[PDB]
């Protein structure tokens, strides 16, 4: 809905305090009960918080559920990684007959430790050369924080041409993933020495290469 | 145990119709508000209908009004949402949930969610190659094989190893979306070396809009 507004991000370290806010109106946060939501990347949302400072089942007293006029606030006391997550306040509108959401905030954990990036590349498979069709497949993994960049190299000239990079997505032991596949002809791979993936973080390069000997 | 069971998702063209299912077990549940509420892919929540526990009673988000209709059969506790004249926009994932009241509103017990695409391009089944073990990776501790999942329209694919019995060590990434408007994945696992000359590894890829359900064995390259 985003008749609420919360922040789209907020950042604290393990150990501390962070709250979010969520401001709407007379109509709606106002005279109406607020309920807080955590979503799990790819999962359905979790009620945490509902008559606005109310924890569900299992939820610890970490978690508290604030409001003041026309804003709600959630609270997060000694605050852990397993919290990293996206948080949406919930409520009643007396004026549309709707329930409404804030746009949701991505709540980061600060200080995670660096780590550099699991590469694996694959050539193409026999099955796909014999369809007369080619795909160099890089598998991206356990890297943190979630930003790399892909170049691709056939004998370490660069190809621009044929790349699909994902956008970097979240583990679920808070590191990230991605996937980069170069698309060539049977005859673009077999003439060439070797083709090169490689991925670079935190400006450091991680680099993999397969040749067509086999 | 208590729950939501939801069924119904998949591709259809702008015009066009699609129920969305959700069966509850555990609660009386001929009682209690139920409502659907969707989700557009990096976007946030949106609610989207709400009916009372008898049907008496419905709401509708002015996004949906003439178009989306709420109901339930109270005697096969099931709770639908027929979805008619879609369009691109109405392209999300949609949860079923259980409206409950005790000072105020909440929903309490959720659906796994489905995917709804909204768009005038087919169903195509993925093409699906073995990524064996390079003849190096091998001589050493741990080796990585896995299947690429070519080509594909809509999402979701699920790829299992073994049928199942092979959990540990998978990693399935995330489908990069090509300029061609299909989707490609990979699914990897990592697996002692040793095991590669004694032990069968086969992924088993379901593509349930195109009803592809393929098992490719994956064997190690002996090539030089
Ligand atoms: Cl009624």
């Known amino acids: 809905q985003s008749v609420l507004t919360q922040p789209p991000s907020v950042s604290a370290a393990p150990g501390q305090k962070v709250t979010v806010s969520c401001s709407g109106s007379?109509?709606?946060?106002?005279?109406?009960?607020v309920s807080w939501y955590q979503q799990l990347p790819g999962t359905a949302p979790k009620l945490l918080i509902y008559?606005?400072?109310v924890l569900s089942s299992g939820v610890p007293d970490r978690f508290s559920g604030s409001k003041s006029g026309t804003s709600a606030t959630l609270g997060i006391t000694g605050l852990q990684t397993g919290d990293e997550a996206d948080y949406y306040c919930?409520?009643?509108?007396?004026?549309?007959?709707?329930?409404?959401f804030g746009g949701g905030t991505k709540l980061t954990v600060l200080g995670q430790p660096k780590a550099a990036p699991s590469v694996t590349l694959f050539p193409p498979s026999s099955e796909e050369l014999q369809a007369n069709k080619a795909t160099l497949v890089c598998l991206i993994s356990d890297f943190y924080p979630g930003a790399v960049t892909v170049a691709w190299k056939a004998d370490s000239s660069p190809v621009k041409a044929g790349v699909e990079t994902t956008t970097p997505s979240k583990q679920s032991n808070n590191k990230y993933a991605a996937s980069s596949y170069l698309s060539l002809t049977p005859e673009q791979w077999k003439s060439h020495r070797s083709y090169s993936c490689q991925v670079t973080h935190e400006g450091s390069t991680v680099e993999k290469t397969v040749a067509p000997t086999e | 145990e208590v729950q939501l069971l939801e069924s119904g998702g998949g591709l259809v063209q702008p015009g066009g119709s699609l129920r969305l299912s959700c069966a509850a077990s555990?609660?009386?549940?001929?009682?209690?508000?139920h409502v659907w509420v969707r989700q557009a892919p990096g976007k946030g929540l949106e609610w989207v209908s709400a009916?009372?526990?008898?049907?008496?009673?419905?709401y509708y988000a002015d996004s949906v009004k003439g178009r989306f209709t709420i109901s339930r059969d109270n005697s096969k506790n099931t709770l639908y949402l027929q979805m008619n004249s879609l369009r691109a926009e109405d392209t999300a994932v949609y949860y079923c949930?259980?409206?409950?009241?005790?000072?105020?509103?909440?929903?309490?017990?959720w659906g796994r969610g489905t995917l709804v695409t909204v768009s005038s391009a087919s169903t195509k089944g993925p093409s699906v190659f073995p990524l064996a073990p390079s003849s190096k990776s091998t001589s050493g501790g741990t080796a990585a094989l896995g299947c690429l999942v070519k080509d594909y329209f809509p999402e979701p694919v699920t790829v299992s190893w073994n049928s199942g019995a092979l959990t540990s060590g998978v990693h399935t990434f995330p489908a990069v979306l090509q300029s061609s408007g299909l989707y490609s994945l990979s699914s990897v696992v990592t697996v002692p070396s040793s095991s590669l000359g004694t032990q069968t590894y086969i992924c088993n890829v379901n593509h349930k809009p195109s009803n592809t359900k393929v098992d490719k064995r994956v064997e190690p390259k002996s090539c030089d």
């Open positions: 009916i009372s526990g008898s049907g008496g009673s419905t």
């Open positions: 008559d606005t400072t």
């Open positions: 555990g609660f009386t549940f001929r009682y209690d508000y």
């Open positions: 007379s109509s709606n946060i106002g005279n109406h009960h």
């Open positions: 919930g409520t009643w509108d007396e004026l549309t007959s709707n329930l409404v």
């Open positions: 949930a259980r409206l409950r009241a005790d000072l105020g509103l909440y929903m309490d017990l």
